[PDB]
Design a protein around this motif. Sequence first.
Motif, short mmCIF file in Angstrom:
data_model
loop_
_atom_site.label_atom_id
_atom_site.label_comp_id
_atom_site.label_asym_id
_atom_site.label_seq_id
_atom_site.Cartn_x
_atom_site.Cartn_y
_atom_site.Cartn_z
N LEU A 31 -3.22 2.71 9.91
CA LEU A 31 -1.80 3.00 9.82
C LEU A 31 -1.43 3.26 8.38
CD1 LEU A 31 -0.46 0.32 12.31
CD2 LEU A 31 -0.84 2.72 12.82
N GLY A 32 -2.01 4.28 7.76
CA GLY A 32 -1.33 4.74 6.55
C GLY A 32 -2.15 5.21 5.38
N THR A 33 -3.31 4.65 5.21
CA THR A 33 -4.11 4.83 3.98
C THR A 33 -5.12 5.98 4.09
OG1 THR A 33 -4.11 2.89 2.46
CG2 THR A 33 -6.18 3.35 3.70
N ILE A 34 -5.67 6.20 5.29
CA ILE A 34 -6.70 7.26 5.52
C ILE A 34 -6.01 8.56 5.96
CG2 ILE A 34 -8.70 7.93 6.90
CD1 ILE A 34 -9.09 5.71 4.66
N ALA A 35 -6.42 9.68 5.36
CA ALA A 35 -5.88 11.00 5.69
C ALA A 35 -6.27 11.30 7.13
CB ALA A 35 -6.51 12.03 4.75
N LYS A 36 -5.36 11.92 7.89
CA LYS A 36 -5.60 12.37 9.25
C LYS A 36 -5.75 13.88 9.22
CE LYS A 36 -5.97 9.93 11.29
NZ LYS A 36 -5.46 9.80 12.65
N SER A 37 -6.71 14.35 9.98
CA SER A 37 -7.06 15.74 9.78
C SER A 37 -6.05 16.68 10.46
CB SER A 37 -8.48 15.97 10.20
OG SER A 37 -8.66 15.47 11.47
N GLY A 38 -5.18 16.13 11.33
CA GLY A 38 -4.18 17.00 11.96
C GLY A 38 -2.80 17.08 11.26
N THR A 39 -2.55 16.28 10.23
CA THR A 39 -1.20 16.16 9.67
C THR A 39 -0.73 17.52 9.12
OG1 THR A 39 -1.88 13.89 8.85
CG2 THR A 39 0.22 14.77 8.00
N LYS A 40 -1.56 18.22 8.30
CA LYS A 40 -1.09 19.45 7.66
C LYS A 40 -0.74 20.47 8.75
CE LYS A 40 -3.38 19.30 3.14
NZ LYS A 40 -4.33 20.00 2.22
N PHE A 77 0.82 -1.22 0.00
CA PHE A 77 0.00 0.00 0.00
C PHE A 77 0.85 1.27 0.00
CE2 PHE A 77 -3.85 -2.33 0.75
CZ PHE A 77 -3.39 -3.48 1.38
N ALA A 78 0.37 2.29 -0.71
CA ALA A 78 0.90 3.63 -0.72
C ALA A 78 0.34 4.38 0.50
CB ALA A 78 0.39 4.32 -1.98
N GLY A 107 9.60 5.78 2.86
CA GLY A 107 9.69 5.78 1.39
C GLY A 107 8.37 5.51 0.66
N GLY A 108 7.20 5.83 1.26
CA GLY A 108 5.93 5.96 0.53
C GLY A 108 5.01 4.74 0.59
N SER A 109 5.53 3.56 0.93
CA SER A 109 4.79 2.29 0.92
C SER A 109 4.87 1.59 2.27
CB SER A 109 5.46 1.37 -0.04
OG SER A 109 5.13 1.83 -1.32
N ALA A 166 -8.07 -4.95 8.19
CA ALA A 166 -8.57 -3.69 7.67
C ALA A 166 -8.19 -2.55 8.62
CB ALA A 166 -10.06 -3.75 7.38
N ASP A 167 -8.06 -2.85 9.92
CA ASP A 167 -7.57 -1.86 10.87
C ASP A 167 -6.18 -1.40 10.49
OD1 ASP A 167 -9.78 -1.86 12.45
OD2 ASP A 167 -8.98 -3.35 13.85
N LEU A 168 -5.25 -2.33 10.21
CA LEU A 168 -3.88 -1.96 9.84
C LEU A 168 -3.89 -1.08 8.60
CD1 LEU A 168 -1.89 -5.31 10.09
CD2 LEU A 168 -1.78 -3.33 11.65
N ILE A 169 -4.75 -1.45 7.66
CA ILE A 169 -4.65 -0.81 6.37
C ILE A 169 -5.24 0.58 6.52
CG2 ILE A 169 -5.57 -0.76 4.06
CD1 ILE A 169 -5.41 -4.11 4.40
N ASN A 170 -6.30 0.74 7.30
CA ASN A 170 -6.94 2.05 7.37
C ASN A 170 -6.22 2.96 8.37
OD1 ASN A 170 -9.43 2.20 5.50
ND2 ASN A 170 -9.57 0.19 6.45
#
Length: 224
Positions: free
Chosen positions: A107-116, A20-21, A167-169, A101-105
């Motif tokens: 830890l990495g795939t879903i945008a977090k609203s605090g990152t920016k 996953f990216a 490195g993105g993945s 599905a917990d790992l995939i969502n």
Amino acid sequence: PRGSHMPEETPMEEEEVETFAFQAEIAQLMSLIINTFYSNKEIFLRELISNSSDALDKIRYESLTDPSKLDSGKELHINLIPNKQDRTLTIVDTGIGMTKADLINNLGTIAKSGTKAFMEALQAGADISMIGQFGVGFYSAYLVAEKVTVITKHNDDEQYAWESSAGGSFTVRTDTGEPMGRGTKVILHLKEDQTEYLEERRIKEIVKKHSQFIGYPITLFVEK
Ligand SMILES: Nc1ncnc2c1ncn2[C@@H]1O[C@H](COP(=O)(O)CP(=O)(O)OP(=O)(O)O)[C@@H](O)[C@H]1O
Ligand SMILES: [Mg+2]
């Protein structure tokens, strides 16, 4: 007619992998975390122990409503396992664990609203300690780790390994290592200059400093 066979004279397991990216801003955060100097990196351990603590709260409550949930293990705790040989620091809990599905969502795939907001605060000179207020604290692991593997077991799924060298993945695979029973194991593969986090004195220091108010027992396992 044989009296004695020697050892050299006496099946292929198949593991499914998915790659996953990271979500774009998650990937940007990771680069910023990895490629910039921060003092005060020790806070990574507070973030991981808070996550364990949260996952232990979850099982404690789920099991009030259903004793059955603790069939996979009654004892609610956190263990810290430094290994100087292979340069890993392992945080283990017996909380809820994560489904595939917990790992995939989560830890990495879903945008977090605090990152920016976190990235702007950091480029303005915020202490990385502030990461705990931005809902992205898991990624503090990459302050000290070149690779992170997460082994996890939730009552409702099989045992999974998530892994990333940034490195993105990241990858998620079915895991047939030693069975876990229930909970999560974060395995930090420490960067070469971050080996202080394998010393028992340093680990005690930073738990005392940052994780004094955790409502489950923490044990440190020190190889003799
Ligand atoms: N030890 C663990 N056991 C179970 N799930 C874990 C875990 N460590 C991380 N996770 C999962 O990864 C998610 C993201 O963790 P973090 O990056 O720390 C943000 P958070 O802890 O959810 O935010 P918050 O501090 O605003 O409540 C958690 O919400 C959880 O779903
Ligand atoms: Mg957290």
